[PDB]
Ligand binder design. Structure first.
Ligand SMILES: *[C@@H]1O[C@H](CO)[C@@H](O[C@@H]2O[C@H](CO)[C@@H](O)[C@H](O)[C@H]2NC(C)=O)[C@H](O)[C@H]1NC(C)=O
Ligand SMILES: *[C@@H]1O[C@H](CO)[C@@H](O[C@@H]2O[C@H](CO)[C@@H](O)[C@H](O)[C@H]2NC(C)=O)[C@H](O)[C@H]1NC(C)=O
Ligand SMILES: *[C@@H]1O[C@H](CO)[C@@H](O)[C@H](O)[C@H]1NC(C)=O
Ligand SMILES: *[C@@H]1O[C@H](CO)[C@@H](O)[C@H](O)[C@H]1NC(C)=O
Ligand code: NA
Ligand code: NA
Lengths: 723, 723
């Protein structure tokens, strides 16, 4: 019980090295160990996130809601009470794990407790009065999402846009300085004009130049001055070529540079944190013996709690893979590489195929012959001609049937023939190569997926299921196979498919900002946009709904911009998505401000600044990752190969049978014995493959100054371990 | 005559090292030397450019012209004949300088001869018929501009956008591939709708999705589908978030990376070309003596033809500054640095001020005391409070006089008092510091310039000159002094003012592309846009001009987009500038195509692709230069200090009086003798300051692999100098 307490404690010291938290897990009692084990279970994470998504997705049943989900007020008030009750359960177990002083000084938990208190109080107020008040506190409900473990990518993304914000704010200050100067001079030059509503008041000119900054109304503000005096074009040329050409590109440059330094120090602090984590782990497995090292049974324990799904043969392989010495023990230099060796999967050296062992003759030459021909180059070179024939067939059938080849309810024999030939070569390729040897590439599962949609088109044509005909309309996705010829497409789609998870996280941060702005706009802008509204405004043309009932058929004219409501979450997400692409945003602004006040211009101006920050940080991320990988591949997974003897396997078998593990460890070592008996050899030569990530990539790039970081951090340990 | 022929030939070998041309100047006769000297005179350059700008600026007098400059047809036909006659004079002297084989194999000159031939022939045709034909050949007239010497920056910029074009074109191909897929499926889903003109035909849907790609009509195309089925938002969300979020940012990343490699190899090939230039220069000054080196009188000759304006004392200073050895001769290692030492200006060590030598007492304590106090910190700290008082005064007077503080014809005592205090401290600072010690900074000449505008405001207020009142309207430019407090503004405005010449060149390349597209659109789109035109089109609302003559005052409504003509060069430059900022470009497209054909959509689509290339290359340039300087200042002009003795100055005086130069060399060495006699010393200690450029910056950055470039190039000389 003493050793296993040391093994679980040391396995915690490795697990906390990856998630960038400071070290708090040191137990005085075993109750803290049981509390860590209770709160870092996989079930606790899924409970925490599913409560958070229930608490967000309940907001489409509130007093502004879709009409099909309009619950009664006590129902959703009680559902908020139960969801907040189990969030109190979450914080109760967090308090049991940490202390009391650590639970207060930790900032993130205290933020979540405060938001819990205010939403709990206002929920009880709703349940008493049974009428919803203004209830603007729902915008803070995102904090329950972001504190979860599964969106820690969202969290470090969000602090990365926080840290890059001062070099944004100063250049934003310079840009606003020039628009106030040009708004003053614009008010002087064009206010003496009874024809334009664009420069009637100095505040109205500040508004119209803030909209001109983002290129939203450019010719329409220039024209009434350009009608009188043709030399007024120099005003808008000089203004727009200062801001759109100097200052905006300057802003992209400055945020890009700061993003580079933040990436460098993020990597550095992660390395130093992993360094102290491994040093504490080696310290807990101290020897009190005349050599300094770790015996094999302790490394059994570390791989028995950390990485629990790794069996015995791979455990001994990881012990030799870290060894790199002819010793019975380990070191530190041969032990700091534990993160990059324990992450791989081990295989033996067979040469078989997954569909040949059952086979006798008279059919083995068939399938082996298919594997032979499917490895040939001219077969692939035949397949690209088939795809090109498909593409010319779609193009010629298009410009012969005059574009009417898609609405018809009979397929003109193209999609039948082509899906047959793609399908039989799909089945031939998979059965020829084996399933896992086929799935291991990238483009092949794309071929499998798109034909997998495509057979449902045949399920849609011959049967009585009309609305699946759009799969038949998606013929030309098969031409996307053909991009794998040119080299730059393979490179740039490799980096596209490798940057996808971070762009998913950036998208979810953007949905956080949309959620809070959608709620805080949902309450104040509820029913202020109707058809034929805002008729006294200046953009009254866009809000119109006119019947022309001549001929008893009432042909209707409408400008449709009244559909951008703020009625529920769904119309407001569609509206806010129409504001982040920039064009025609001042129409929604001038409509809402023509119904509420002058102060609600400030809502939309603030929204444009926030979406400007988020989009320029997305651009900066894509540029850094693409430049970093392109600099790697012009300065040059991984496969390791080791081997173990027969007698070492027998002795380790004696130790494992002594230690009395499960039957799987014994019988898989017996299976290794059967492989040595069937092949009639002495040593088992193995392979371990690991995929290459950004961490090892950054180690190869910053390999010049990294030793200075280690040595400086070593003496800063000694300055902080004499006190 | 033998030595001076060697000096002028070697000075040519240095001058051709900078301008990246290959070596052709080797003379068999002195006539080639006289031809080089005739064609690289400063007068020849100014003749070449002024002919080119006359030939471009004549195009605003043609058959499409402004009505105030409408010349007769024989007049401008003859002016084209004379301008092309002197361009033939230019090519005649170019042919005299080179050979005949070199003049043909050189590509750039042969391009200019061919364009000369076709414009000469069509000019004679105009002079015969006296009526202008379609005359589309004027778009090629830009080649006469770009071949000049003063816009060689334009030329290397233009080949840099040529070389970066394939990694643009392949991703453009992928982006067009996805818009054709979504146009097919958009035509299937929304053609069964009698309410929208956006998906009536497959070609019309390809057009509207190509416009949706550039965010020009985003809500207006979404709405008629969004009115029927609210789930049609997923179509435009998925489409716009593939293209605007993955592919467009991918295009910026790819063009950025290629721009980095092109910058690296541009710097490398410039270094190797300078290397061979100096080796030929040292070869022409070969010794045929028992040491290997260059005597002083030959270095006199090199500095007498190369850098002619450098006098004798600075010549000897440059001979010791290259020496770095106790030798009477030179080397190669001490001679490859000739470009970076000959570029500086030498000064002595005085300590006086430019306004103190005349002064006796009773006024010397005045001006010296002013220099004392103007060097003090709390005086500057007083001045920033004065500027902040000015800013709060403008703001409070604005929100007290309700924005009407600018139209009034009396100044409310602010601009009088503030221009007096800024003015007296300007004169106090300049007279206290001296003129050249004041101008040498950056912000100080900004203060001088803005107050220099500001006194003309007092010339405008009290006098009978009304239209200069806008200088009084430009009060708040004085607040731009106050940005020099925060550090990041000083850094980012240093890089802004240091990247300005290249952005000027990028702007002039953009005006080249506008010029050719303005002419080729001027002839075919001449009178096709009138008021109340295009009424059968779909954008007929924008072209309207209606009188409402009730009440005998005729209040007029108009949509103003008929002013974007193609009548002359000036309305067409204003139109094309309205197309490069993107917004509302499809209205000009749909108008012109509603008057000509369907084929003139292709004009505007081609223009959007061209301006997309040019703008993303401007963005890539700003990012590289800003990142490069920010990486320099986080891995860390120049001043050198040397001295010469008295006897060395006397001996070199004997040699210069032997060689019988002008009186300036003798009498300035006599002035150095008078300084040694007045200060009563032995040695003159001097300083040479040089401004830091991108070349030395790049030498400090790429200092790791540069020796490999030199040694590889040395053996590639030996492989190319055994044959
Ligand atoms: C502009 O809109 C207002 C409503 O905001 C219209 O005013 C209404 O006019 C009708 C006559 O058609 C009256 O019966 C209502 O009592 C008015 N309502 C209010 C609140 O005043 C106005 O007519 C519209 N102007 C137009 C369409 O030109
Ligand atoms: C649309 O514009 C055309 C001109 O392009 C107009 O057609 C003219 O109509 C007037 C009657 O007002 C006739 O006298 C002319 O002979 C017509 N010209 C041509 C070339 O057909 C037409 O009326 C306009 N339609 C509107 C304003 O609804
Ligand atoms: C137009 O007529 C329809 C009935 O066909 C009606 O539903 C709609 O409200 C009318 N629009 C008005 C009165 O603005
Ligand atoms: C409107 O009236 C003015 C005269 O005040 C005239 O110049 C203009 O051509 C008229 N516009 C029309 C008839 O469209
Ligand atoms: Na836009
Ligand atoms: Na951009």
């Amino acid at each position: 019980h003493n050793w296993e307490m040391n093994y679980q404690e040391a396995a915690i010291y490795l697990q906390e090295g990856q998630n960038n938290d400071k070290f708090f897990t040191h137990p005085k009692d075993a109750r803290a160990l049981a509390a860590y084990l209770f709160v870092h279970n996989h079930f606790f994470y899924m409970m925490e996130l599913l409560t958070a998504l229930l608490l967000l997705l309940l907001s489409l049943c509130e007093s502004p809601a879709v009409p099909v989900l309009k619950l009664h007020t006590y129902v959703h008030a009680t559902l908020e009470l139960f969801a907040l009750m189990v969030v109190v359960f979450e914080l109760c177990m967090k308090l049991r794990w940490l202390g009391f002083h650590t639970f207060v000084r930790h900032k993130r938990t205290m933020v979540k407790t405060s938001v819990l208190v205010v939403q709990f109080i206002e929920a009880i107020v709703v349940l008493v009065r049974q009428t919803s008040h203004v209830r603007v506190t729902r915008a803070l409900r995102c904090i329950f999402l972001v504190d979860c473990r599964y969106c820690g990518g969202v969290r470090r993304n969000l602090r990365q846009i926080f840290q890059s914000l001062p070099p944004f704010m100063d250049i934003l200050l310079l840009l606003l300085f020039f628009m106030i100067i040009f708004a003053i001079l614009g008010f002087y030059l064009f206010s003496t004009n009874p024809s334009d509503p664009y420069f009637s008041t100095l505040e109205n000119s500040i508004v119209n130049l803030f909209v001109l900054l983002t290129t939203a109304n450019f010719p329409d503000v220039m024209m009434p001055s350009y009608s009188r005096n043709p030399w007024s074009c120099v005003f808008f040329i000089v203004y727009l070529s200062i801001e759109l050409y100097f200052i905006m590109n300057l802003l992209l440059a400055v945020v890009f540079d700061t993003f580079n330094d933040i990436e460098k120090h993020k990597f550095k602090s992660l390395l130093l944190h992993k360094r102290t984590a491994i040093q504490h782990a080696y310290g807990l497995l101290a020897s009190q013996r005349r050599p300094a090292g770790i015996s094999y049974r302790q490394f059994e324990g570390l791989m028995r709690f950390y990485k629990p799904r790794m069996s015995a043969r791979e455990r001994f392989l990881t012990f030799k893979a870290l060894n790199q010495s002819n010793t019975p023990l380990l070191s530190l230099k041969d032990f700091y590489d534990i993160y990059e060796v324990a992450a791989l999967q081990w295989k033996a050296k067979r040469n078989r195929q997954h569909w040949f062992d059952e086979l006798p003759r008279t059919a083995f030459l068939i399938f082996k012959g298919i594997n032979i021909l499917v490895n040939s180059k001219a077969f692939q070179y035949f397949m690209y001609l088939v795809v090109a024939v498909n593409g010319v067939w779609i193009l010629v059938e298009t410009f012969m049937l005059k574009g009417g080849n898609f609405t018809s309810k009979h397929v003109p024999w193209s999609y039948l023939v082509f899906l047959t030939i793609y399908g039989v070569e799909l089945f031939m390729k998979v059965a020829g190569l084996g399933p896992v040897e086929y799935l291991s590439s990238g483009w092949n599962l794309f071929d499998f997926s798109v034909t997998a949609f495509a057979f449902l088109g045949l399920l849609a044509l011959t049967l009585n299921m009309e609305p699946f005909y759009f799969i038949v309309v998606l013929r030309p996705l098969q031409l996307l196979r053909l991009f794998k010829l040119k080299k730059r497409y393979r490179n740039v789609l490799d980096t596209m498919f490798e940057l996808l998870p971070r762009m998913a996280s950036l998208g979810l941060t953007l949905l956080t900002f949309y959620y809070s702005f959608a709620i805080v706009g949902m309450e104040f802008f509820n029913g202020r946009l109707t058809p034929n509204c805002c008729n006294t405004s200046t953009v009254a043309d866009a809000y119109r709904f006119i019947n022309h009932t001549v001929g008893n058929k009432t042909k209707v004219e409408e400008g449709y911009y009244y559909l951008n409501n703020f009625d529920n979450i769904l119309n407001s997400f569609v509206t806010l998505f129409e504001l982040t692409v920039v064009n025609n945003w001042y129409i929604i602004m001038e409509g809402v401000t023509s119904q509420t006040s002058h102060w609600s211009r400030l809502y939309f101006m603030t929204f444009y600044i926030v979406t400007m920050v988020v989009m320029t940080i997305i651009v900066a991320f894509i540029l850094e990752a693409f430049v970093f990988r392109m600099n790697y591949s012009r300065k040059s997974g991984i496969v390791i190969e080791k081997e173990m003897s027969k007698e070492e396997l027998m002795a380790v078998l004696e130790l494992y049978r002594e230690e009395r593990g499960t039957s799987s460890d014994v019988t898989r070592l017996l299976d290794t014995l059967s492989q040595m008996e069937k092949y009639q050899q002495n040593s088992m030569v193995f392979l371990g493959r690991r995929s290459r990530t950004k961490s090892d990539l950054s180690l190869k790039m910053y390999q010049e100054e990294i030793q200075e970081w280690y040595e400086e951090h070593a003496r800063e340990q000694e300055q902080q371990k004499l006190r």
